[PDB]
Amino acid sequence: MEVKELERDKNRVVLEYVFGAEEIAQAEDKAVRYLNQRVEIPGFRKGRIPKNVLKMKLGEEFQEYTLDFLMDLIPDTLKDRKLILSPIVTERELKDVTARVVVEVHEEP
């Protein structure tokens, strides 16, 4: 969880929080949990739905939840700062794992 200051308009700042991997795990987990006590899935016991299920039967919604939990860590960061109004959240996004590789090919003619 490393934050980086973008712009500063006198007393109006705009910080950028970027969360680690493990951090997303826990956040994910808080989600998985938070949901189990709120939704029901045809084929599973109450509060027993696996993450693979939710993650696939929730679509980008589960992704939002995971982010929500990641937000909580924020408050506990501005403790030393003397604030006026509660910090707003301009934007946010969760980028899933991804791999890339380019290759060079030669054809006939």
> Does 54 reside within a domain?
yes
Domain with 3, as residue range(s), is 1-78
Tokens 């993450």 -> residue: 51
Q: Is 32 helix (H, G, I), strand (E, B) or coil?
A: helix
What tokens were used for 80? 């030393």
In one-letter notation, the amino acid at residue 8 is: R
> Does 93 reside within a domain?
no
Is-contact 32 47, C-beta < 8 A? no
> Does 109 reside within a domain?
no
Which value in Å is the resolution of this experimental model? 3.2
- Which residues are within 8 A (CB) of 26 and not within 5 positions of it... i.e. 6 or more apart? 69
DSSP assignment letter at 28: H
What tokens were used for 97? 């794992």
Query: Alpha-carbon torsion 63, 81, 83, 79, what sign?
Result: positive
Q: What is the Cα–Cα distance from 27 to 67, expressed in whole angstroms?
A: 7
